[PDB]
Design an enzyme around this catalytic site. Sequence first.
Site, PDB file in Angstrom:
ATOM      1  N   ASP A   1       0.866  -1.217   0.000  1.00 16.64           N
ATOM      2  CA  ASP A   1       0.000   0.000   0.000  1.00 16.64           C
ATOM      3  C   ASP A   1       0.895   1.257   0.000  1.00 16.64           C
ATOM      4  O   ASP A   1       2.008   1.185   0.567  1.00 16.64           O
ATOM      5  CB  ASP A   1      -0.987  -0.041   1.168  1.00 16.64           C
TER       6      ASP A   1
ATOM      7  N   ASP B   1      -1.765  -0.202   5.866  1.00 18.16           N
ATOM      8  CA  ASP B   1      -2.508   0.418   7.008  1.00 18.16           C
ATOM      9  C   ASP B   1      -4.031   0.199   6.887  1.00 18.16           C
ATOM     10  O   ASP B   1      -4.737   0.714   7.776  1.00 18.16           O
ATOM     11  CB  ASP B   1      -2.128   1.894   7.186  1.00 18.16           C
TER      12      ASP B   1
ATOM     13  N   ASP C   1      -7.081  -2.423   1.932  1.00 16.99           N
ATOM     14  CA  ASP C   1      -6.208  -3.612   1.667  1.00 16.99           C
ATOM     15  C   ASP C   1      -6.442  -4.773   2.666  1.00 16.99           C
ATOM     16  O   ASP C   1      -5.699  -5.781   2.549  1.00 16.99           O
ATOM     17  CB  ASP C   1      -4.727  -3.197   1.593  1.00 16.99           C
TER      18      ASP C   1
HETATM   19  F1  ALF Z   1      -2.326   3.676  -1.332  1.00 15.07           F
HETATM   20 AL1  ALF Z   1      -3.651   2.969  -0.361  1.00 15.07          AL
HETATM   21  F2  ALF Z   1      -4.943   2.184   0.603  1.00 15.07           F
HETATM   22  F3  ALF Z   1      -3.270   3.912   1.105  1.00 15.07           F
HETATM   23  F4  ALF Z   1      -4.077   1.979  -1.780  1.00 15.07           F
HETATM   24 MG   LIG Z   2      -3.272   3.441   3.007  1.00 15.88          MG
END
Ligand code: ALF
Ligand SMILES: [Mg+2]
Length: 1055
Positions: free
Chosen positions: A433, A760, A764
Amino acid sequence: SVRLSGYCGSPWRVIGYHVVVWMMAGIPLLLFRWKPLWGVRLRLRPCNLAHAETLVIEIRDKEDSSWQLFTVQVQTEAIGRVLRYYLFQGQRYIWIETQQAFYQVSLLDHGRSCDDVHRSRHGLSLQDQMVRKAIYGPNVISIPVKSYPQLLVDEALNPYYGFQAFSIALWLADHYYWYALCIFLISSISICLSLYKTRKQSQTLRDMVKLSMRVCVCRPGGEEEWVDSSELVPGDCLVLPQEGGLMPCDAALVAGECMVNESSLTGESIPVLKTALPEGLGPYCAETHRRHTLFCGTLILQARAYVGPHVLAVVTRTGFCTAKGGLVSSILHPRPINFKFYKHSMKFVAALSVLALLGTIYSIFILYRNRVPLNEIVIRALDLVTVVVPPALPAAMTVCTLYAQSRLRRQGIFCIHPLRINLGGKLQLVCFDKTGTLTEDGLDVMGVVPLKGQAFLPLVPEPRRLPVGPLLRALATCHALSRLQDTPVGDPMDLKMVESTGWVLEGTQVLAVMRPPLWEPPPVPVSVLHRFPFSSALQRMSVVVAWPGATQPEAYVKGSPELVAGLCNPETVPTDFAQMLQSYTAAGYRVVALASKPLPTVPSLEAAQQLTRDTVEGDLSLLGLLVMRNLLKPQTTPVIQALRRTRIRAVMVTGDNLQTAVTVARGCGMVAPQEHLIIVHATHPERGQPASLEFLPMESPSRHLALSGPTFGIIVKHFPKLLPKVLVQGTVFARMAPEQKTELVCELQKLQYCVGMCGDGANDCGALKAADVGISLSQAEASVVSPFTSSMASIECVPMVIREGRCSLDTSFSVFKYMALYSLTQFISVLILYTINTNLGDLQFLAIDLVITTTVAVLMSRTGPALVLGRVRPPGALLSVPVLSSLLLQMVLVTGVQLGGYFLTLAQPWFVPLNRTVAAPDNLPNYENTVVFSLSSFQYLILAAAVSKGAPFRRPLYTNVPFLVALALLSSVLVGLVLVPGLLQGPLALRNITDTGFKLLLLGLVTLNFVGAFMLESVLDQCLPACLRRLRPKRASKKRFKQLERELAEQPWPP
Ligand code: ALF
Ligand SMILES: [Mg+2]
Ligand SMILES: *[C@@H]1O[C@H](CO)[C@@H](O[C@@H]2O[C@H](CO)[C@@H](O)[C@H](O)[C@H]2NC(C)=O)[C@H](O)[C@H]1NC(C)=O
């Protein structure tokens, strides 16, 4: 393609098969069942599919013949005449009796026209609500919490617990009470801990997923505040709250305009504008549009009504049908973990069972030739099976993981399900992520551009070193912030601007007075005359401010740079502005422009301050632009270099814009300056002409690919042959739906990549569960679903779990080898004595099984990981030529010494043969037992030391002082027991030897096998890899990713 079948039978016949298995409770069934499919097919009594209790749904993949087996309960409920509902795989497949037809929930969708949803602007009568409530169920995601007996059935179905139970029964029968208790008690705590953990996770997940917000259904009779919570129907109409509100159902806004946070859906905290759906005659469902629709779990920041009395929306999806529900279905119903080591271990344990069957016949015949009682033979025959297959083997292997968990807890990484630490060792790909994992969570003002002349001017690095004068005033007093007790309450970006300058905010119409940092190298503390808000349509906020110099006030309008340019005078506006804006947008720097109008207004007069919002903002001079971006992190660049140096691959999966992902990935070092990045776009076949794959390169001063979610969708359906060629070469996946994040991990792992997700979460969470190793970087939402949770809040956790895994898997290899060797060396000793109508005495077996094995198994697993990560990876295959060869050759040496010693003892003239009349227990003290036991005892200590590899993945063996001490003290006790006639000889049932020479030769045999075992293991370890290349030079990997990387090497897909 699903195979759906009806079921009924005689109640006595069902009771009959309940007498066969339900009384048995299944534990014998699995003891006689390799796999249940044959039994499952026709255990249940079949009938017409018209009427049923449960439904056998056998879902086939036609291509791969993937006939997956399921059995599902029939729901019978009365709307007013009973309707048949089937709850298949979570989702509702609804059966109409009149047409004898299954219809899945959400088959309502026929592309219901934009006008059709508009036609149903207001919710229909309590009769419609009544039937719809029956058709779609309540507006909730029902996570089942299962009973301790039901949990116990699934855990205790594990065959090893069956074998352990059989073993513990035989041990109580043969009077081996002490060890029996130890294995039972160890099992009891292990099952309990599993049951407690299993229930707790479901309990937390059920608590987390449940949302309880009261809502106001809009009906002419029924449009009242907080009329319901869980009753909201898929066709019903609702009033969006005029402030902050968490959306309970996926819906489309009929009337007004709203600003929403999509952090649940996308992971981007920046607010998104949603506008009233235009009424469309054309037969189009909103599913495709995804633009004027507010989803379950999203937060409505602001809801603005202009065309109607209040903001008005119509529901689209409810309960399990909503996207959130899709993710809850994703985190439920989980496929088992595919780990070569664990399956190969079970095959090896099975192979030992075949040797036990052979051993049993040799035992039976030779004991029958010895003319022992029938009773003895059945207990002893079975006893040998429990000697061959070690009943403690699972418990031993856990001790490796239990230590590694303790080390991880000290490092601040809280790991549930510690057996998943082993999977750390085998990781070839870590998926990341972007927002709050690789990059810092909040956007940070990098710099401001002056625009001093006609053309644009260079960006200023430090806002704290604000250029003293109108820019300094403008930056400090450009606040929508409300004054709070020792705090500014407002938007973070607005706070960041104020913070970055260092100015602190504390007359008749003076509001929110602005003062300096309280160091002077102008203080000029200033009052805000007027304030106008950032309306989403307008894209501009205006603060009129006057400094304490008896001067004309200046009106500062902060807006979107194009809108600011449009408002701004063309002489003020530069030609290069478009290029500067484009460049900063491409760089990922958020561009927000602030313009100044000198105002001839008397200060502190409300009449003078008061004007039309458009007239105040109409024409200005652009004072500057403001540039804000994520700062990667301090430790992000280092970790990625180490992973790349190790040859572990890194795939950026983000829910954000692809341009942002490209620049952050380049900064990260996922794509190095030399490395070339290609952007892959797939155009969907809307005109009926089939889908076109387009490949466009990116220029910058291991060829790899960058993709979008829409593209990924078109490749996953319309380019199935090319998807593998994407997946093995794709390093950045952007604007990926929370479902698509799971699907990437699913398709990666079918290509044989062992895959790890670091995120986080809330978007995800699906990927965190799906990934073999799941690391949460947040204590809320992600933590509950993830097997591993950091508190460090960095990517730096990922290398620590790889290291700890590499140690754990290498330790697990050694402990399995020890447990295999201990069972076989005991198996030789028992058979060698059984030939002569003798056995290892009770309390001699206890010495080996209780004190020796437990001591070496607990103390050999203390070794912490190697200091630095290396390119070489720990092996995944327990059933392999290198390990099997080591075991075969070690056992030849072990058998050698025992047989040699026995025959040497027979050869010596002092030797007297045993009774052979009276039985194995009855002949307590005997030379043959004494010599076999005495030699055998040292081998268990020798083998333990030999199998510990140490150096490449773990700290050196000499560093593990406790293990060397444990072996030294145990060795001393054994050497004493042979050398000096001792009291302990009485309890251990050992006969002292008069000839010191023979005893020194017996120790001689020990030191031969000590040196021998260490040399034999060392030589095999050194030469076997070289021998492998000599034997098979052209040998090629079976792993699909390895094959696809080779094909790509021959000819490059999108060159
Ligand atoms: F970049 Al993200 F959930 F924080 F896909
Ligand atoms: Mg994120
Ligand atoms: C080996 O077995 C036992 C060991 O206690 C002894 O055998 C018994 O000896 C007595 C005489 O002392 C006889 O009356 C019994 O018939 C024997 N029973 C059995 C089952 O052996 C003796 O030391 C050895 N046995 C023989 C036959 O010499």
